[PDB]
């Protein structure tokens, strides 16, 4: 992790970057801010290229589509709480997700959006904007405090609130038991395992494959090849000052990095050359680009 670049939010005494993701153009990073702006920065020079007023409250999450034509954002106190933005020619809102506090694209083909509203998952069609499915089963709910619904790599399954849904039938097929209060889980990009806090479960058998205590209360980010996993532990920074890497095949530790500043967000480029981290000097955040 060699530092390659650093920059702060132009013309702000209190730099307010809150999240980041690489755009489909390699040299440019998208960043959300605590006042609801989306910014495009040249990640190497630090130049602010563009700003758009996406929301009137802090941006908590953003996801650019692979093709470069679309962006998801989520905010904190706004309506719509999340939105899908079209980026071609004249950036504007395409669809809005009124009370979804978190949103992601489908994985295999990015033709859908899945939103989370508390313990409820919503599935939307990109072309039409129509809400296709609402996924909630009161008998199976775990009520995870940081629930984030997600598709599996092939888009045929959903994990919401620790419950596995079959998308075609729109019905729950398994409930994973609750062993923490906050972390709801993600699919491994390998399509074989679900990672729910410290428990790694087999999707085929539902057996426990691994116990990984170091993942407790962590957000998990994979590199684009799915071979390295980054875990940043929740503690206005959401995370503390260090993050860990793990080998994504056996969950073994690789490294622990303490940047000595609390972390807001971290992300990888598609070629897996870099890790961009938002780090608080204070709020007064900077973005550091590290070469992995």
Full DSSP string of the chain? -EEEEEEE-TT-SS--EEEEEE-SSTTEEEEEETTSEEEEEETTT--EEEEEE--SS---EEEE-TTSSEEEEE-SS-SSSEEEEE-SSS-EEEEEETT-SEEEE-SSS--EEEEEETTEEEEEETTT--EEEEE--TTT----TB---EE-TTSSEEEETTEEEETTTTEEEEEPPP-SSSB--EE-TTSSEEEETTEEEETTT--EEEE-GGGTTEEEEE-TTSSEEEEEEE---SEEEEEEEEETTT--EEEEEE-SS-EEEEEE-TTS-EEEEEEE----EEEEEEE-
211 is written with which tokens? 């116990």
| Cβ(34)–Cβ(77) below 8 Å | no
Q: Which two tokens stand for residue 152?
A: 């599996």
Reading the block at residue 3, the tokens are 């530092």
Cβ pair 116, 81 in contact under 8 A = no
Residue 183 has φ and ψ, to the nearest 5°, of -90, 120
- Kindly indicate whether the domain formed by 1-292 is annotated with CATH number 2.130.10.10: yes
Residue owning tokens 């056996």: 250
| Residue 129 φ/ψ, nearest 5 degrees | 85, -5
Cis, peptide link before residue 272, omega less than 30° from 0: no
Q: What are the residues whose beta carbons fall under 8 Å from the beta carbon of 236, sequence distance 6 or more?
A: 283
CA–CA gap between residue 279 and residue 75 (Å, rounded): 19
């Amino acid at each position: 992790f060699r530092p390659i670049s650093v920059f702060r939010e132009a013309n702000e005494d209190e730099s307010g970057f809150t999240c980041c993701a690489f755009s489909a153009r390699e040299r440019f990073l998208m960043l959300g801010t605590c006042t609801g702006q989306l910014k495009l920065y040249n990640v190497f020079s630090g130049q602010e290229e563009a700003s758009y007023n996406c929301h009137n409250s802090a941006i908590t999450h953003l996801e650019p589509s692979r093709d470069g034509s679309l962006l998801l954002t989520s905010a904190t106190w706004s309506q719509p709480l999340s939105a899908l933005w079209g980026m071609k020619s004249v950036f504007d809102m395409k669809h809005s997700f009124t009370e979804d506090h978190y949103v992601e694209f489908s994985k295999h083909s990015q033709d859908r959006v899945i939103g989370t509203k508390g313990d409820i998952a919503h599935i939307y069609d990109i072309q039409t904007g129509n809400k296709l499915l609402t996924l909630f089963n009161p008998d199976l709910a775990n009520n995870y405090k940081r629930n984030c619904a997600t598709f599996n790599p092939t888009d045929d399954l959903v994990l919401n609130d620790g419950v596995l849904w079959d998308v075609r039938s729109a019905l729950a097929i398994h409930k994973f038991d609750k062993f923490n209060m906050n972390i709801s889980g993600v699919f491994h990009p390998n399509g074989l395992e679900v990672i729910i806090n410290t428990e790694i479960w087999d999707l085929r058998t539902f057996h426990l494959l691994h116990t990984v205590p170091a993942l407790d209360q962590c957000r998990v980010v994979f590199n684009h090849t799915g071979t390295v996993m980054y875990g940043a532990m929740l503690q206005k920074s959401p995370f503390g000052s260090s993050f860990r890497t793990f080998n994504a095949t056996d969950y073994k530790p690789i490294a622990t990095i303490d940047v000595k500043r609390n972390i807001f967000d971290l992300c990888t480029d598609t070629k897996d050359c870099y890790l961009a981290v938002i780090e608080n000097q204070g709020m007064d955040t900077v973005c550091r680009l590290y070469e992995v």
